[PDB]
Amino acid sequence: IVGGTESSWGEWPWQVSLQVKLTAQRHLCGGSLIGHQWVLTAAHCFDGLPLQDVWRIYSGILELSDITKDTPFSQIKEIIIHQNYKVSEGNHDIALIKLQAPLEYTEFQKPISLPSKGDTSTIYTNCWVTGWGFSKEKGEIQNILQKVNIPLVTNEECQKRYQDYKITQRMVCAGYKEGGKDACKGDSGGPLVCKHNGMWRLVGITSWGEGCARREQPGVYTKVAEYMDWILEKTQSSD
């Protein structure tokens, strides 16, 4: 996150860190807890390492430096990548992760609500993006979970800044005209949440973008409301 500030315990209790352990262990992506046994993230997080065994998922965590050899983590039982997602591209950039065991809820580990069928035409005005990504282009993974407030833009505005790509109705974009606040590398797969009628809703999944916090260069997010039939089918069907 560029231009953000430190989050607090309990502030974003759905935020998870998806890490890979080979010889060394590294944070690769964010994700969002959406049920006891379900995390929602970006499909692209699995382009390089598509197999489940190397992944470790940390929840109820503020500071990555708190992780030690003994820190408990969830494991991946199933990765469900959208059937129309193409590796390395921006369409249908969404994946469900089923955990090997269900997690209990606490005030520091609980789910983000998904958008409601009633809120199809809602214009969201208090939106935030979180993660442990770089605080500048070619920076470093941040220790304490960062947060930043970013306004949504229209798809037409977003398309003006991405002439080489197609912005679709299944994407949503967010950014400031003069830049300065944005997601960056390592935030991908994490949440874009907006507070509507007193509750937080998962509106986006951090997906792609050119640079970080550049002027007239919004971030692109998978628009979660457009995948609700798919989420409910894949989850209900699995359990």
């Epitope: 692209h44 997080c45 382009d47 390089g48």
Partner: antibody, heavy 122, light 107 residues
Framework: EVQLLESGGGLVQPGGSLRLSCAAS????????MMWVRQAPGKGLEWVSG????????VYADSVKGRFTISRDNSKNTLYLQMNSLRAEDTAVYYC???????????????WGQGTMVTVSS | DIQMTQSPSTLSASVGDRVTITCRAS??????LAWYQQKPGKAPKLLIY???TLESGVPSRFSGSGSGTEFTLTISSLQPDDFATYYC????????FGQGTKVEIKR
């Protein structure tokens, strides 16, 4: 970050062979086009070989076609350049480079190694 | 082969100058053109790709324009770190580099 380290450079006689390696380190979800580029003493950069996807198009500059073979051992995370029938004019620093496939993800289009020196002389 | 020609071959400038370098392709390469900076004894560094997109981490004083066969790189205000050789690269068909433009200190 993702990092690239070349090795295998050295002194070889005309007609001899040499195999360069480029070992990739780090974790990434990105896929890459993989190239070898060289620079002779006091000269410009010259692209010589590439591989566009896993087991995909391997291609060569006319200057090396028929003498060089580019390959990947994914299990070792390593890119190779096998160089045969070497000649004086193949003398150069050899660099491996990765180029990002697909949409930008707040990340880099190019990754470059450090270079390894190859000297062909009798 | 697609041949790439840079001009000028050398150019002399001072800190604070606006500097422009041109690259010509022997046939159309659409916008598949990149620009690099290289210092003696070091690997080159990517500045600009797809003719005008700024690479991750590159300062905003660098910009590029053009499409087809004629391209420019501009350094809006030259800094001490910018004296170096610059190469264009077509990537329409494989890669081909231009011969380079050295940017040196005027006196």
């Amino acid at each position: 970050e993702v990092q690239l380290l070349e090795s295998g450079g050295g002194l070889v006689q005309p007609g001899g062979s040499l195999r360069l390696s480029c070992a990739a380190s780090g974790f990434t979800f990105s896929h890459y086009i993989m190239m070898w580029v060289r620079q002779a003493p006091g000269k410009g950069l010259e692209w010589v070989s590439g591989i566009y996807s896993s087991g995909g198009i391997t291609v060569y500059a006319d200057s090396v076609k028929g003498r060089f073979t580019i390959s990947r051992d994914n299990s070792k995370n390593t890119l190779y350049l096998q160089m045969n029938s070497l000649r004086a004019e193949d003398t150069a620093v050899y660099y491996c480079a990765y180029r990002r496939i697909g949409v930008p993800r707040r990340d880099e289009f190019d990754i470059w190694g450090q270079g390894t020196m190859v000297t062909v002389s009798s | 082969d697609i041949q790439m020609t840079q001009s000028p071959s050398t150019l002399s400038a001072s800190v604070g100058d606006r500097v422009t370098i041109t690259c010509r392709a022997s046939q159309s390469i659409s916008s598949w053109l990149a620009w690099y900076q290289q210092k003696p004894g070091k690997a080159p560094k990517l500045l600009i790709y797809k003719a005008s997109t700024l690479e991750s981490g590159v300062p905003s004083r660098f910009s590029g324009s053009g499409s087809g066969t004629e391209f420019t790189l501009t350094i809006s205000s030259l800094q001490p770190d910018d004296f170096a050789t610059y190469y264009c690269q077509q990537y329409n068909t494989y890669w081909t580099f231009g011969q380079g433009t050295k940017v040196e200190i005027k006196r």
